Chain A
Amino acid sequence: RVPGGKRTQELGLVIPMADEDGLTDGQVAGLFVIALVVFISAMDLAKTMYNGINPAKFKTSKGKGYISPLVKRYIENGF
């Protein structure tokens, strides 16, 4: 390394480098699996945010919706 700046040269500040590898390739692959999971989930979230809420789902979607018993209490507790 060719240092720059007065202080590094006049104090002898050095930047050690590990002679080992750091992380093995297996650990990097393990991180990349979960990174890919984040990536897929983020693409799905971006799609959902782009399209937004669909209010007309009650005409076609199955089920009948649900309001959790605490959500009702929060509704009638005030605002």
Chain B
Amino acid sequence: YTETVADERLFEQVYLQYTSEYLKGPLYWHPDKLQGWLPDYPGTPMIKEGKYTSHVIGNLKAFSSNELAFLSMLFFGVGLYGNLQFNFYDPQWAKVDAGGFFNVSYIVESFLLPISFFMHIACYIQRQNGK
């Protein structure tokens, strides 16, 4: 037997297939495997099965899909109402210009529109995982 180039290539393939599996394990300890680096944080897997895991939505991971859907629609309604009642209907610009003050309810509500967007995103993420 002499080591043909095909045999060397076979050793290359065997070595790479074994080592690529070994380095993923708890026995390689590379700086690229630290927290904040490539691997997910220990108790908080973000993506599994090609689907956003429940841990993505942070403190909302315990919320039900129905609860998140209700919160999403409610926040959408309230925030859209605030934006429409601040910009087009019931404008506050003239009132505040003459020394008045903003209708604080409108300002608080209008911030619930993007919150509602991300809330409905979280609702879909929860629904995918069956929660």
Interface of A, secondary structure class, is loop
- Tell me which residues from 2 to 20 in chain B have a Cβ below 8 Å from any Cβ of chain A: none
List chain B residues, Cβ under 8 A from A79.
34-37
Q: Once A and B bind, how many residue pairs between them come within 8 Å at the CB atom?
A: 7
Shortest CB-to-CB span from A59 to chain B, Å, is 26
CB closest residue in chain B, given A78: B35
Cα distance A79–B36 when bound, in Å?
A: 5
Give the number of residues in B that approach A within 8 Å (Cβ atoms).
5
List chain B residues, Cβ under 8 A from A78.
35-36, 41
**Interface residues as binary, B30-44 with A (CB distance below 8 Å gives 1, 0 otherwise):** 000011110001000
**Interface residues as binary, A10-28 with B (CB distance below 8 Å gives 1, 0 otherwise):** 0000000000000000000
CB closest residue in chain A, given B41: A78
List chain A residues, Cβ under 8 A from B36.
78-79
Cα distance A79–B35 when bound, in Å?
A: 6
Cα distance A78–B44 when bound, in Å?
A: 14
**Interface residues as binary, A60-79 with B (CB distance below 8 Å gives 1, 0 otherwise):** 00000000000000000011
Cα distance A1–B35 when bound, in Å?
A: 68
Cα distance A78–B40 when bound, in Å?
A: 12
CB closest residue in chain B, given A76: B35
**Interface residues as binary, A38-65 with B (CB distance below 8 Å gives 1, 0 otherwise):** 0000000000000000000000000000
Could you list which residues of chain B lie within 8 angstroms of chain A, going by C-beta atoms? 34-37, 41
Q: Could you write out 7 A-B pairs with CB less than 8 Å apart?
A: A78-B35, A78-B36, A78-B41, A79-B34, A79-B35, A79-B36, A79-B37
Q: Which 3 A-B pairs have the closest CB atoms?
A: A79-B36, A78-B35, A79-B34
